[PDB]
Amino acid sequence: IVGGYTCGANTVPYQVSLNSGYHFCGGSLINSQWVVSAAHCYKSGIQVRLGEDNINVVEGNEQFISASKSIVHPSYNSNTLNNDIMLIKLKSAASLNSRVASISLPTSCASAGTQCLISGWGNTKSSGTSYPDVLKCLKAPILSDSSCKSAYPGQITSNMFCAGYLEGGKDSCQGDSGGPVVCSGKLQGIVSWGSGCAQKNKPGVYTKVCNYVSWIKQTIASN
Ligand SMILES: N=C(N)c1cccc(C=O)c1
Ligand SMILES: [Ca+2]
């Protein structure tokens, strides 16, 4: 997250870190056994880390649970990043409490202008490279589909939306991928892609979660 703020320990209780020997992506806990992330985050040997603030220090609220299975969206295209969504099942159910909690799925899509909270342990610099140890947060509005398409000609599908600031300086970044965009307590987006980070006229692009609620529910119901 570039241009954001320190969230505060366990203030984003649905935020997960995906770990394969090191943090490599975010995710969102959607019930005691399932995490939503980006398909582009797919790899084998994932350990889901819940209750994290400092990802380099054991602070007392962590739950580390190995993934038992991953399900990339049937229509994920890695070239265009269309349908950039994946489900991860935990080997055991997470113990839910105030600091480890699921986030609600939307029942309808969010509109341009809605303020959302975007979070992660990704790069904090738009030019350089600096990775934070503690969870970073950004409040950002959803942008109109027209401005999103104007920013990224030929690249925005109906499964994507833009959020952030066309002026630059405030954005998600490398390492935030797969993490949440939460709007009025609903998971509306997944950190998916962008051109650089926090660049002028290049806002963040997010997977449009409301399109996938049917697929998520039915997938969970049979797995
Ligand atoms: N600018 C962003 N919001 C973003 C998100 C995820 C990855 C990347 C970099 O390729 C950029
Ligand atoms: Ca920790």
UniProtKB/Swiss-Prot annotation:
PROSITE patterns: TRYPSIN_DOM (PS50240), TRYPSIN_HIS (PS00134), TRYPSIN_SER (PS00135). It is found in: Secreted, Extracellular space. Its cofactor is Ca(2+). Transmembrane segments: none annotated. Disulfide bonds join C7-C137, C25-C41, C109-C210, C116-C183, C148-C162, C173-C197. Residues 1-221 form the Peptidase S1 domain. Coiled coil: none annotated. The active site is at H40, D84, S177. Its EC number is 3.4.21.4. Ca(2+) binds at E52, N54, V57, E62. Is inhibited by scorpion cyclotide trypsin inhibitor TopI1. InterPro entries: Peptidase_S1_PA (IPR009003), Peptidase_S1_PA_chymotrypsin (IPR043504), Peptidase_S1A (IPR001314), Serine_Proteases_S1 (IPR050127), Trypsin_dom (IPR001254), TRYPSIN_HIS (IPR018114), TRYPSIN_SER (IPR033116). It holds the Pfam family Trypsin. SMART domains: Tryp_SPc. Its main location: secreted. GO terms for molecular function: endopeptidase activity; metal ion binding; serine-type endopeptidase activity; serpin family protein binding. It comes from the Eukaryota. Keywords: Calcium, Digestion, Disulfide bond, Hydrolase, Metal-binding, Protease, Secreted, Serine protease, Signal, Zymogen. Belongs to the peptidase S1 family. Interacts with SERPINA1. This is Serine protease 1. It comes from Bos taurus (Bovine).
